[PDB]
């Protein structure tokens, strides 16, 4: 009648990914934590692009699109920012947005690469993530230019895929299918998983009817917008917040019925 106690065992932690194992929880809890990695984690991404001038070969909406998908360092600001549509400001402010300015004219015979470095924030914490090279926004011939002001705002992955912090969330349970959820026609042809523990003589594990899905293996690779562990912390906090608001509306409706 109550919730089982899950537990976490982290196998590695890198600045790109985090790889961990959640034991003693249900399948739907585990899938939902994956889906909240993909969608419900809020980050900071550009959403309001004002093109002051443009002479580049790419048109305006293509440049605003490419400025959308640039990841921004939002490791601690996104907990402080309000959602833009929730703020009481005069339609933009530093409490719900981060200002960016790009001002590039090519005055040379070399093809000048307007990269992500030319995005200049007023907030020193929210900067584009780019060791690695910068993200190419637009190339420029001599004579061409672009000037724009771009406001970034808090949002999450259901709204648009530019607010998705994860590169990839690998998720697997029962890597030798003792549960036999998937039924291979010829299990000899099938490669073993990374988490398989059977010897090379054996193809798949023996079936147990009394088993249930547990020991969920995750590999959460971030795109750079968040550290891969604060994706998981923000996801758990967001799922608990969604459930708490659902409980508050539930209490209101029960008090309305009685």
């Amino acid at each position: 009648p109550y919730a089982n106690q899950p537990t976490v065992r982290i196998t590695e932690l890198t600045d790109e990914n985090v790889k961990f194992i959640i034991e003693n929880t249900d399948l739907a809890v585990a899938n939902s934590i994956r889906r909240v990695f993909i969608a419900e984690v809020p980050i900071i991404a550009i959403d309001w692009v004002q093109i002051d001038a443009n002479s580049s070969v790419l048109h305006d909406e293509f440049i605003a699109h490419r400025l959308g998908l640039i990841p921004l360092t939002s490791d601690d600001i996104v907990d402080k920012l309000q959602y833009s549509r929730d703020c009481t400001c005069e339609e933009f402010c530093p409490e719900c947005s981060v200002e960016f300015t790009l001002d590039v004219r090519c005055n040379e015979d070399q093809t000048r690469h307007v990269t992500s470095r030319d995005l200049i924030s007023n907030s020193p914490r929210v900067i584009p993530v780019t060791e690695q090279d910068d993200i190419l926004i637009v190339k420029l011939r001599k004579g061409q230019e672009l000037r724009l002001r771009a406001y970034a705002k808090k949002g999450f992955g259901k709204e648009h895929a530019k607010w998705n912090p994860t590169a990839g969330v690998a998720f697997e349970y029962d890597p030798d299918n003792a549960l036999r959820h998937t039924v291979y026609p010829k299990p000899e042809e099938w490669p073993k998983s990374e988490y398989s523990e059977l010897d090379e003589d054996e193809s798949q594990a023996p079936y147990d009817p009394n088993g249930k899905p547990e020991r969920f293996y995750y590999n959460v690779e971030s795109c750079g917008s968040l550290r891969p562990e604060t994706i998981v912390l923000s996801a758990l906090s967001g799922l608990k917040k969604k459930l708490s608001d659902l409980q508050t509306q539930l209490s209101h409706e029960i008090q309305s019925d009685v």
């Binding site: 959403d47 692009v49 004002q50 909406e61 605003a64």
Partner: protein
């Protein structure tokens, strides 16, 4: 009141009048390109 057009091949700019034959001053090139508007544009980055 004059409209500024960009002179096609010349890539320079010049004024134009109502009921004015469309000619550049540099080489008389016949194709003008109207400059980009001065009012604001705003794109949702979606």
């Amino acid at each position: 009141q004059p409209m500024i057009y960009i002179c096609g091949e010349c890539h320079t700019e010049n004024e134009i009048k109502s009921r004015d034959p469309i000619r550049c001053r540099e080489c008389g090139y016949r194709i003008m390109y109207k400059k980009r508007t001065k009012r604001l544009v705003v794109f949702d980055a979606r």
